[PDB]
Design a binder for this molecule. Sequence first.
Ligand SMILES: Nc1ncnc2[nH]cnc12
Ligand SMILES: Nc1ncnc2[nH]cnc12
Ligand code: SF4
Length: 225
Amino acid sequence: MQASQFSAQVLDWYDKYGRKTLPWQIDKTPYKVWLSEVMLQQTQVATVIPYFERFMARFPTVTDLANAPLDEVLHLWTGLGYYARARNLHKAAQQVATLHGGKFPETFEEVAALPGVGRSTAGAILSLSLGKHFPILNGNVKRVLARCYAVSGWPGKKEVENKLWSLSEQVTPAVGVERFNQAMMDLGAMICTRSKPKCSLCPLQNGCIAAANNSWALYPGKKPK
Ligand SMILES: Nc1ncnc2[nH]cnc12
Ligand SMILES: Nc1ncnc2[nH]cnc12
Ligand code: SF4
């Protein structure tokens, strides 16, 4: 299947089966999408929700987060693990307060310059909260694209990561980008799982090479040896 059919099938699936009601998806702003993306990169949705709610209630705005003591941020992070994310969250909130006058940057370069925010998280912040035309590529999306397009090779090799970023760019639409990017994350998280993917519940099952060859185990490639 062509890039235009990938996008259309994923958006039609999201419409009927996607997750649309999580708290970071309601009255989306750059700040809320950033906060949730950072919490979500190493923690599952069920554990993140109470923390997302407590952080939004305590820190309504990024300036509130910036002005809080770091020890108060770490105390409220307790239970989420991977505390470098919390230290960078706080540094990034202070960078928005100092460089961007308390308003979360809405351009790619300034968002990706924030501590703890990579190319995929910056693309996620801007595409999901403002509908800007940016692709994402976290572990879950890497798996969906690598299986659908048979991208063998370890994504830790620059050549394979570039291939996967090119594929993401090719299948990501401008129209409906916020719905498409959330749907790709949902598919990788819930359908195209690391083991035994639920191919029969996947909107890409008619064109996916791994589903046609029952070779999901080969994609993406793991680290050598
Ligand atoms: N917005 C999101 N929804 C679900 N899983 C995610 N993983 C990272 N970001 C996510
Ligand atoms: N199906 C699965 N879902 C999530 N993590 C996994 N690790 C191995 N198999 C998995
Ligand atoms: S058809 Fe199966 S292997 Fe292919 S993208 Fe969907 S869940 Fe993953």
